[PDB]
Specification:
The chain contains 3 helices and no strands. With 84 residues, it is mainly α. It has a domain of 53 residues. α1 packs across α3 and α2 packs across α3. The protein is globular, with a radius of gyration of 13 Å. It is classed as protein binding. The entry lists the keywords Antiactivator, DUF2285, Quorum Sensing, protein binding. It forms a monomeric assembly. The entry is titled "Solution NMR structure of hexahistidine tagged QseM (6H-QseM)".
């Protein structure tokens, strides 16, 4: 391709996958930044090392999508969906 798609998404639709399953350690690193109330641009640049000047598109992708499984992996952590 003209751009490198290394992943830039979270395995959700099909199933959780082997390749990204090796990355889940960094997921725990990612959600920590979101809990700091950091914006995607901020986080992406810090946690993914992606400056949003360089690549804002994948920056927000890797942040939002990966935090999705990071936070969702803690069933009783996200008291918003689990909010009763």
């Amino acid at each position: 391709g003209s751009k490198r798609k290394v992943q830039d998404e979270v395995p959700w639709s099909d199933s959780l996958t082997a390749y990204d399953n090796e990355h889940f350690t960094i997921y725990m690193r990612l959600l920590d930044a979101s809990a700091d109330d950091a914006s995607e641009d901020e986080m992406a640049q810090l946690v993914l090392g992606i400056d949003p000047m360089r690549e804002p598109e994948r920056a927000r992708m890797a942040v939002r999508s990966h935090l999705d499984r990071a936070n969702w992996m803690v069933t009783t952590g996200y008291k918003e969906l689990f909010a009763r």
